[PDB]
Homo-oligomer: A and B are copies of this chain.
Amino acid sequence: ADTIVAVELDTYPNTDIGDPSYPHIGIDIKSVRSKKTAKWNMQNGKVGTAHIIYNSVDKRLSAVVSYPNADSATVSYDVDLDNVLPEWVRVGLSASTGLYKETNTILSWSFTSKLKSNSTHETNALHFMFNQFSKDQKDLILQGDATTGTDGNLELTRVSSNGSPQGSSVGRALFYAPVHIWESSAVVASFEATFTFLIKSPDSHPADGIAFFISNIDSSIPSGSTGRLLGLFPDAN
């Protein structure tokens, strides 16, 4: 199977697979059953911002999700990504819907990764910033139901011609270039990601969520990973 590290923005409480009984953010290390979660007051129809950070000095993956004028939700987990991911990865966004549904609309996405050796200063970096998505956007790999360009946004899951979100949908967008996330003899490595999103739904209990993820380069949507599996995992183990 793929190898996945992710930050989930999980809108739907699947208590039969260990979710808490409320919408939540979580750190997922090789399982949908998050290693750490925090309560998240998702605001239906408002634009939110997610920030994700990591560095190899502290070996701590952290995320903060906010809406204007409200308390943020923050979650952190101590993990050494050298012990989890391959050296080269792709980074992406994923989302899903199930019985219940929501738009999984990405309005912007930026990412930076740095890798520094002990040679003097000698540091490599990748940075991208999408504030407008186009169709046929050749620097993204779209998987499943994801589309780009409608109103300049990335729609990870299916929406009808008028903006009604559909159930049983899954889609992802991966940046085209591989990213060098760690190296045996690097002095320091770090990354950060930010995205803004609009989750809107007619349902009183929207579903299923959005995730930022890091995977093996050749990662693909696992069969059946709509709904609670967020396009990331083949099962709930």
Choose one: B58, B72, B74, B129; the contact of A123 (CB below 8 Å). Answer: B129
Contact, CB under 8 Å: A66 / B187: yes
Oligomer copy total: 4
**Do A194 and B121 contact each other (CB < 8 Å), given the known contacts A57-B76, A72-B187, A138-B178?**
yes
Tell me whether A119 is interfacial, beta carbon within 8 Å: yes
Q: In A104-143, which residues have CB < 8 Å from any B CB?
A: 108, 116-132, 134, 137-139
Instruction: Tally chain A residues at the interface, Cβ within 8 Å.
Output: 55
Contact, CB under 8 Å: B122 / A129: no
> Which residues of B sit under 8 angstroms from A152, Cβ to Cβ?
117, 119, 122
Contact, CB under 8 Å: A49 / B118: yes
Chain B nearest Cβ from A181, distance in angstroms: 11
Please name 5 pairs of A and B residues whose Cβ atoms are closer than 8 Å in the assembled complex, sorted by A. A47-B120, A55-B62, A64-B187, A124-B131, A138-B217
